A paper describes a structure:
Nonmuscle myosin 2A (NM2A) is the predominant myosin isoform in nonmuscle cells. Together with its paralogues NM2B and NM2C, NM2A enables tension and force generation, driving essential cellular processes such as membrane protrusion and retraction, directed migration, adhesion, and cytokinesis. pmcMyosins are molecular motors that convert ATP-derived chemical energy into mechanical force. The motor domain, which drives ATP hydrolysis, is composed of the N-terminal Src homology 3 (SH3)-like subdomain, the upper 50 kDa domain (U50), the lower 50 kDa domain (L50), and the converter.
Here, we present the crystal structure of the NM2A motor domain fused to an artificial lever arm in its nucleotide-free state, resolved to a resolution of up to 2.0 Å. The fusion construct, comprising the NM2A motor domain linked to the artificial lever arm, was produced in Spodoptera frugiperda (Sf9) cells, purified and used for crystal setups with commercial screens. Multiple conditions produced crystals, with one condition further optimized to the final condition consisting of 16% PEG3350 and 240 mM Na-thiocyanate. This large disparity is primarily due to differences in nucleotide state, which influence the opening of the cleft between the L50 and U50 domains and lead to substantial translocation of the transducer region. We present the first high-resolution crystal structure of the NM2A motor domain, which demonstrates significant structural conservation with NM2B. Mapping of known MYH9-related disease mutation sites reveals that K373 is situated near actin-binding loops, optimally positioned to influence coupling between the actin and nucleotide binding sites.
Residue numbers in the entry: 24 to 198, 201 to 560, 564 to 616, 642 to 849, 860 to 1016
Write the structure that this text describes.
Amino acid sequence: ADWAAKKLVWVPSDKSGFEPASLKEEVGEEAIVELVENGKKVKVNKDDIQKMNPPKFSKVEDMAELTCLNEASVLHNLKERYYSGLIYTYSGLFCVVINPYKNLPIYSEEIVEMYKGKKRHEMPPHIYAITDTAYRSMMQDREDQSILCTGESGAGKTENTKKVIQYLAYVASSHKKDQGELERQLLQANPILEAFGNAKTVKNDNSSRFGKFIRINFDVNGYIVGANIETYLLEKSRAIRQAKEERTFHIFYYLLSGAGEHLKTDLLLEPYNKYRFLSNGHVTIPGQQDKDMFQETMEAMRIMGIPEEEQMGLLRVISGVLQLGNIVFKKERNTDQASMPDNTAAQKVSHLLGINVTDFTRGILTPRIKVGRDYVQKAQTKEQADFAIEALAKATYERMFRWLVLRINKALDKTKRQGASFIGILDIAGFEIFDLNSFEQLCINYTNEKLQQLFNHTMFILEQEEYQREGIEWNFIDFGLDLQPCIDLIEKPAGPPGILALLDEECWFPKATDKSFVEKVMQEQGTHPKFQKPKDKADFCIIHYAGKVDYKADEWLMKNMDPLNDNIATLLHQSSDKFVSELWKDVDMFRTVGQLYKEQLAKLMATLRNTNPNFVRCIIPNHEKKAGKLDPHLVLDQLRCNGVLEGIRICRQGFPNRVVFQEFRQRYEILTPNSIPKGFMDGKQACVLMIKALELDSNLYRIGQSKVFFRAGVLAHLEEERASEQTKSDYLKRANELVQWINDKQASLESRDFGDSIESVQSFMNAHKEYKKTEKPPKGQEVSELEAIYNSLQTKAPAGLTPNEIDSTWSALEKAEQEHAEALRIELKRQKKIAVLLQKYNRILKKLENWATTKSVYLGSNETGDSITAVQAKLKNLEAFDGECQSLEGQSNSDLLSILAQLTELNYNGVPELTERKDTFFAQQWTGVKSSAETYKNTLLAELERLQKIEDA
């Protein structure tokens, strides 16, 4: 919610690669940030901080749509998708896949149907979409396709290729068991090529040292007709020397430790510590046995259909390749001609390779060179003879490998249906950055530099097609040209000669050394943009797309030498061994590995530039093959190498976040509330009105036909202001509802109509106490939280809605509660005095009512008596009654007038009614008693007269 108020950024993290942090303060070139996780303040460099995407860009399916295009945002987007079960993620053209090390239900036959004919944006990212779009582009555009897969895992890349083939075997097959045979044979060709083409390096225990191009052939109607395997850029130099902790190709160790004693004898095999070509001896591969893998390799060849005598030819040549390194030449006394005092190694080489030892010895020591018309024998130094033997071993192993690829295609492409189109799957060793980068790493990084240039150009063509569809002017040079200077730094023959050209020149001079080669690179190429001096064992640095790479030019001269002895090549072409003769059937030296590498790569790049390229990036999540565990630095390292971040750099420089007109207006109209009329229909002009209301610089946006194209970070800022504006609306809406409640409650508390009853007044007390217990506290909390929101909103206001005005309005409410409760207590005391007076008033009357009634009953008897004294006795009680009434009359009337006077002080309504009730009683009841009292007295006198008359007689 309040994410825009935290100023969240990405800072480097040792544990998690990057982590969120709240930017607090900048001090010059450094910034103070607060780490979200533990709240500790650290100081970091401002150029180490990377912008963070808004939460709306959560688990985006295409990371080219991120508004903040950096490596910290790419890692975060990949991490969240991975832990949510999503291993596929598009990054522009790339299809990034992170190995889940699990069996996911995403490769079902029902999901294959959901991807047929669908576009990338219509479905979640998946290898099926890459395969479908490539297949549909093959049939619509009628041009061949290529799928370039990188990754440093023989398990992840192979499982991705298996999915590509399965999708093609389902969507383009005409007939099941026959529907998976193409995959069945390919899974048998993988171990065969692996033993001869893969090797343990200092960074990968099973690194493929060649490029595999699996072509799926199709007829003119789109049905699969067959498949074959092409290979490129075999690292043949690995056969003669390897770096520390590194092995040559697997097959050498399989044969040396996996062969029985009879095969050892027949192949003249020797222990590990007698072959110079095995630099480090029997380096083992963890969790694997060279002895055991030998059977599996031979097993796969039997399954493939390769006969016994052809497998023996491969083992025999392997033994011959090793024996060449055992030949020792020595410089003789005071003569530059090389000598070979011991011919034991040559006898074994000549026996294993089916040639004559004397022809071989004479052909390396004193070879014939055709001068004019005749063969002229020329001397050879020890160095020339050594390089010739090494070049012969490298060339033989390459010819043996290429023969094996042809032999496997003979099993695969058995029908040779010859299709009209193909989809090629390229599996090449990706970019390599070791602690010590040598000649091999330069050749590898040279290859991937041109492969990444194939990507940048492909993205350039497609992006140029998008801008023209939207009518937006295209003013960009080719994205592949950004990598051209680094490529020309390495490959350019002349003009500014490349590093490979400079190396060739040193290899052709006598006095030249490794130091003199570095001197020529420093002085002739230190001015190059992509060239840098190291800062320090390395000799020079190259700025690849994957960043700066340091190189050490140790032994580069000898590594670049590749002079094929045409004399020995003729001997091997004329070998008596039928297998060796087959390896050297196409034969016929200023010949270098670097120049031979350029041509091989040119053969590959020609193959690829004649196809439509697709790109899939396989990433290892962790080194423990665990599931659901992600190594952030391991992923970051691969992201820097595979060119994912290079594509992210490209669209970061252009307009990467394209937004449809109606979507842009719906999202950001809160920022532009009064610039679009109410009956406005043109959605394109509405965005023009919104952008004009935001003062966005014309360099930040491009208006298209259906979308508006924005630079990077533009949507990040608008999203920030959107959250900043909707939190303001939530404040104003809540502030109005709070003040209107306070005004209404105060207007209610100011009321003084508390009813005219004791139960009426006490009910409003219970309402006032229930208000202060249940209704008031929730509003008081709103006062505090709104003030907190306003102060937060003010750092990153209609009258009455500022915290200072709400605080005063709330105080007037508490003052209204003050007088309300006091007024109720005044009224409750008033209601009780009335009730007590009314009860005491009606008490006096009821006392007089029964007194007026009962005494009138006694008077009604008119008892005079029977004697004169008894009549006067009746007069005694009558005057007592008369004097008693005079006291009871004035006493009650005085108390009744007092109660009426007190009720007038309290402003009682029914005072005139009470006064009438008293005046009625005295005029009716009470005067009737006083009237009946005198009638009795007159009765007591009429009898008192006649009773005295009787006595006188």
